[PDB]
Every structure is written in structure tokens, then in C-alpha cells.
Symmetry: C3
């Protein structure tokens, strides 16, 4: 039928509790992580919350909490949607669970931008737009029928590997500048970027529409954990990196000022 | 049926004259207001149209006329759409009247940005993106079915109140800088922002889909007046503010130059 | 029926080879042109590929290759879509051939921006957003029914003529600055802009939905050539302009430095 054997549209009303629970929990996690990040950025500069200043926190210091909070709002909307599936058995009109990877568009162009701004990686906009385009091909690979979904997957994967290589090069060409104390958080966010991301593309090969190992319910459940790790946990490592940099900057400024007085 | 009792889809062909008229009138108003604003910005700097310069009017001086003109084009498209409902009785393919608050997305992210640029309010992009996201929840609250539209409304209203509080704080933390002559126009645009906006959210509670006091025809008619007051009249007050600032700046420059010669 | 007499939906499975071929060829052309442009921008500054520097190529030097490559990816997706029409006889779920001029949105706001950045034309964002809005009216004129498609066409054409006039003025008010060596490429990209663009609007008058001279198959075939000329060939002239400017800049810097040493 319209709903494939392994879809959430074949599940009966009353059997969606797991999905609502997972999505509410992730909404809370993402929103609260983003709120901690927001508090940390507002409260102060470095690890010891040094008073910001007249201009306040930079506007890019809000990109990171921003994504986490927005993804949490998205997940709350998804859980509201899943609750309609539990009752009416037929979703909402505004379902963020209908189009797969449609929310990942926004989130990704915002995260790659974050990384590229914080680490001062070059071609910030280039990278961010490339990822938006590769995550538009991702949506397509879920909608487009069999033979052509694999052709589209090929294009998307080629570009993903190309952009990944270029990104790797950029981070490794900024390693010299990045202090060793701040590199821990960077390498952790990179690890999240090079392992965690390829996971999204490989889970495709075992998905409900491709193979059929993971049914749509469980695919959705797994993409929630992956979002906690991207979005939320990526931002906590990037927040850490930022704070380390800002504490080291405070230290450097204070030392420069000591030498200025002396 | 698909069309609720109090909808424009239940109205017979030939009974849409009022809607076409209102929407054409508002199109004219918004476009002409934006054109006056455009002329004023191009012609000169302050109230006495002081010759601009080599670079010309700043690109942000076009955000304000821009929105008004675009909303007027939107309303012209809406009136064309309403004319098809008057004749064919079944709308156009490209109807800006189908999805409610879908046009408000663009207009709002552009207006909050305007305010934040002109008054130099901090977190410009943050505020503008927050409003875009809260006006995406607004569209949802019109499409999503009963129980879940109120859950979504709750999220949207929470964020609206949060962003409103934050905005209020920002404007009041910039009051010291803003000259008293320019504050008149600011307080008027703020009044339009804190009263006029909450009106949009409260009319929801009495709308065709929520309660049923205001049928979709009249809801549409009221949202046209509200757009004249937001968009058009908001920009005339903001244009006024800008011009006041620019005239005071011209005065300050001329005084500084007199002291430079002396 | 839903498909008009002169549409690609009336063509039988197996008769789409021409469309696939044209769209694959254009995909290759656009991608390869954009890749040459990308190589040229990365490799060096001017015509003689002068080593760039620490910061590398400006982020706007990627807007031009970018569009060409993205339009090539779009056309590859279109050819994949056309192959489904050749086999299944009913398109893909993600068809870039469904909505007419929907891809032109992105491409156009990116190209006008390019021109305005490279030639330092004023009102860059204004122009780019105007074109995005006029190319949203373009999509409408393909979907909206008879009487109202001509009303929308009128609005779109009025704005197109207005923006065209304003653009002409801007380029002619920057002619004095632009060196004569670089003007060749500029006038060629302008020629592509003032002739080539009006072609898009005039082909509308003879299209499958308006008149019926050009059926949708051949309209699609012609819009592919027009994209090679816009996108691809526009960027090769703009790449040329950029390179000329950069070689002249290198020359000027080297002369200034000779005088600095002397
Ligand atoms: C926070 C959101 C994330 C990390 C989403 C990432 C999405 C991708 C890395 C998409 C990957 C792809 C697919 C699974 C579909 C098409 C092929 C790829 C590789 C672009
Ligand atoms: C110029 C356009 C304007 C002023 C539109 C504003 C729209 C809102 C303030 C939306 C308000 C909300 C709803 C009516 C729906 C969801 C809840 C709110 C408060 C976000
Ligand atoms: C690279 C993409 C290009 C050059 C697309 C350009 C599209 C236009 C110039 C659209 C023109 C118009 C229509 C054919 C429909 C509505 C009326 C116009 C003039 C805006
Ligand atoms: K901070
Ligand atoms: K950042
Ligand atoms: K998300
Ligand atoms: K989804
Ligand atoms: K994050
Ligand atoms: K002005
Ligand atoms: K402004
Ligand atoms: K509007
Ligand atoms: K509407
Ligand atoms: K306005
Ligand atoms: K270059
Ligand atoms: K450029
Ligand atoms: K294209
Ligand atoms: K098309
Ligand atoms: K190009």
C-alpha cells in the first residue's frame, strides 16, 4: 500500500507510546542542553564566567545553543505528532515526521556554520551550503523510488566524501593555531563529525526503505539518539572549546596588561 | 467537510467582492507606503533630504520599504486569488490565502531584523530567527487538529512571551543612547510591537478554527488591517525614527566641523 | 485532463530519451564549467595563477563556481527524474521538473548577488531579493490558471523591467571604475543579462501553458540551453572579469612596491 510493510503508518492506534516517550525525552534533553549552553554563553566569557562586556556575547555564541533548542522544539513537535498517531492513528497536518531528513537541513547548515566560525575554518559558507544541498539529496533518497534513489544516493555520498575530505583538511590546517588545551574539545567534536556523521549515511543502507533491517519506528528512535549526539553533545564539546579559548584569551589579555603596566 | 462551517470555501462564487476589495486596497496602501519610504530613503538622509553620498543609502535602509512593498505584492496576489474564488469558486494554484501565517514568516523575520538594526538592538539575528520559528508554529496551529493545536500554541506563546520580554529589555537598555527626539517614533513602533503583536496571538483564540467568533472571511479582513499597522505603519514610524536620527547626525557633524574649523 | 495536451505527462514511457540526454549533457557541462571555475579560483589569483595567500580565495569567489555546480546537480537530478518517466512513465517523488522555475529561484538570487559583489554594484541584497521575488511570481504564472496568470505576469514583468532598469543604471554608474580590459567580460556578462534574461520572459508568451507553440518537452530542452548560457557561460565571463581584475591588481601592487623600494 502507500505505507510500506515496515512503516509507522502500519502501526495501530495505541502502539506509539515508545515513540512519544523517546521524542519527548530527546526534546527535553536538547532544549535543556541548549539552555545550559545559552546560560553559559550569557553568564560569562570563559570557564570562570568572566563578565562579558557592553556588546555582550557574540551573535555566533547563540548559533550553538540555538540549534540544540530548535531541535528540541522540533522534537517536541514530533512528539505531539506521535501522540496524534497514538490516538487518531493518522498523524497531524504539520508533521515533522512525514518528510525524512527535512529538519536535518536546517540543523546541519547551522552546525557546520558553527564549527567553521568557532574554529575559524575557511570557506564557512561554502561548507554550510554544501551540507544543505547534500541533505536535500538525503530527503530525496527517502522519497524517490528504487532505482533512482541509489543514483541520488551516489551523488550525495560523493559530495559527502568530498566535503568531508575538505573539512578534514581545513581542521588539520588550523590545528597549529588551536591551542592544545582547546584541541581536546575540538578533536571530540571532530570525532563526533567524522564517525557520527558517516553513521547517518550507513544507517540508510539498512533502513526501512532500502533494505528493511530497521523499521521506521526504530529508525526514528535511533535518529533521536543520533541527534542527541550531533546537535546537543556536539554543542557541548564546541561550547567547551569556546570556553577554553575564552579563558585562555582572558589569561593572555591579563598577561599582556601586566606587561603593559610593567 | 474539508471546509469548516466558518470558512471561505463555503462561500459561493460571487460573494467574494469584499475580500478582493479589502486586499486590493491594502495592497495599494502597503506598496505606496513602501514606495514613499523608498523615495524618502533614496532622496536624502534626514528630514530635509540631505544629499546622500557616493555609497548612497545603506542596504538596510531598504529593508523597511522592502517589507511594505513585498507585503503589498503579496496582498495583490491574494486579491488575484480572491478574484478566482469570486469567479471559479475554487482559488488559484498559487494561493497565499491557503496556508495561514505563511507570508507572516518572511515579513516578521524581516521586521524584527529592521527594528534590531535601526535601534542597534543586540542579538539581531537571534531575535529574527526566534520570530521566524514562532511564526512557523503559528502556521501549524492553524493546520494541526484540535488537541495538538493547543499544545503547539502553548509552545509558541511561551516563546513569544520570552522573546517579547527579551526584546523589551533590549529596547529599554538602548533607551539611554536613543535621543529624546527620536524616542517618540521608537516608542510608537514599540507600542505597535507590544500591543499590535499580542493582538495577532489573541485573535487566534476567537478564530474560525479555535472558537468560531470570527469566520475566515472576517479573520482575513482583520489581518489585512493588522498588516497595514504592522508592516506599513510600523515602517512609517521606523522611517521617522531613522530620519530623526539622520537629521540629528547631520547636525552633530556640522557642529563638529564648525569646531574643527574653529 | 490534469496533463495539458502539450505536456510531458502525455508522452508514453520510452519516449523520453531526448530529455534525459539533454539534461545529462547540461549537467555535465554545468558541473564541469563550475569545476573549472573552482579550480581557477583555488589555483590562483589572476590569469597567471598567482599564489593566493594565507586566507586563500575569498568566499565570494565560490559563489560563481557554486551556482554552476549546483545547477549541474539539479540537472542530474532532473535527468534521473526523466529516466523514471522513460521507464515507469510517471516521474519521481522528488522531481525538479514538476514545479517550473522553482530551481531558478535559488540560481537567480545567487547570480545577481555574484554580479553585484564582483562589480561592486550597490544595493546587492536589494537586487538579489527582488529577483527572488520576481522568480516566485514566475513559478506562479505556470501554476495559476488563465485569467490570473496574466495578471501575475504583469506584476512580475513590471518588477523585472524596474529591476532591469535599476541594474543597468548601476553597471553604467560603475563603468568609470571598471578598467577597459575588464569591461569586455563585464559587457559580455551584461549582454547575457539584458538579452538572455528577457528571453526567459518572452518564451513564456509562446509556452505550452500560455500559447502552445513550444510543448513542455521542447520548452524544457530550451531552458537547458538557456541555463548553460546563464549559470555556466555567465560565470565564465564573470570568472574572466574577476581574473582580469586580479591580474591588474597584482600588477598595480607590484608597481606600487617598486615605487616603495625606490
Ligand atoms: C544533526 C544532523 C545531522 C548530523 C544529519 C546529517 C545527515 C547526513 C550526514 C546525511 C547523509 C546522507 C544520507 C543518509 C542521504 C543521502 C546521502 C548522504 C551521505 C548525504
Ligand atoms: C507583520 C506580521 C506579524 C506582526 C505577524 C505576527 C504573528 C504572530 C505574532 C504570531 C503569533 C502567534 C500565533 C497567533 C500562533 C502561534 C502563537 C503565536 C503567539 C506565536
Ligand atoms: C539562471 C536562471 C535564470 C536566468 C532565470 C530567470 C527567470 C526569469 C528572468 C523570469 C522571468 C519571468 C517569467 C518568465 C515569469 C514571470 C515574469 C518574469 C519576467 C519575472
Ligand atoms: K561566552
Ligand atoms: K559559533
Ligand atoms: K532535528
Ligand atoms: K523525520
Ligand atoms: K548544538
Ligand atoms: K535615508
Ligand atoms: K534598517
Ligand atoms: K504579508
Ligand atoms: K493567509
Ligand atoms: K515596513
Ligand atoms: K581567484
Ligand atoms: K563573486
Ligand atoms: K537550475
Ligand atoms: K522545471
Ligand atoms: K555561474
Amino acid at each position: 500500500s502507500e505505507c510500506c510493510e515496515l512503516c509507522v503508518c502500519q502501526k495501530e492506534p495505541g502502539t506509539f507510546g515508545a515513540l512519544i516517550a523517546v521524542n519527548t525525552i530527546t526534546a527535553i534533553i536538547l532544549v535543556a542542553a541548549g539552555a545550559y549552553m545559552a546560560w553559559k554563553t550569557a553568564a560569562g566569557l570563559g570557564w570562570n564566567t568572566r563578565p562579558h562586556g557592553p556588546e555582550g556575547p557574540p551573535e555566533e555564541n547563540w548559533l550553538s545553543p540555538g540549534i540544540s533548542i530548535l531541535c528540541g522544539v522540533m522534537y517536541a513537535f514530533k512528539a505531539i505528532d506521535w501522540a496524534s498517531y497514538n490516538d487518531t492513528g493518522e498523524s497531524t497536518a504539520f508533521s515533522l515526521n512525514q518528510v525524512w531528513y527535512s529538519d536535518y537541513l536546517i540543523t546541519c547548515p547551522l552546525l557546520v556554520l558553527d564549527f567553521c566560525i568557532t574554529v575559524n575554518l575557511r570557506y564557512k559558507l561554502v561548507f554550510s551550503s554544501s551540507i544543505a544541498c547534500l541533505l536535500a539529496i538525503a530527503v530525496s533518497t527517502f522519497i524517490v523510488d528504487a532505482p533512482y534513489r541509489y543514483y541520488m544516493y551516489g551523488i550525495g555520498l560523493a559530495g559527502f566524501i568530498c566535503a568531508g575530505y575538505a573539512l578534514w583538511n581545513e581542521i588539520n590546517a588550523q590545528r597549529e593555531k588551536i591551542p592544545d588545551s582547546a584541541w581536546w574539545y575540538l578533536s571530540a567534536g571532530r570525532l563526533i563529525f567524522f564517525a557520527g556523521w558517516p553513521f547517518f549515511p550507513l544507517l540508510w543502507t539498512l533502513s526501512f526503505h532500502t533494505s528493511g533491517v530497521i523499521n521506521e519506528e526504530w529508525y526514528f528512535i535511533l535518529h533521536a539518539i543520533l541527534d542527541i549526539l550531533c546537535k546537543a553533545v556536539f554543542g557541548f564539546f564546541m561550547l567547551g572549546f569556546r570556553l577554553e579559548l575564552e579563558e585562555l584569551d582572558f589569561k593572555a589579555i591579563e598577561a599582556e596588561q601586566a606587561k603593559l603596566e610593567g
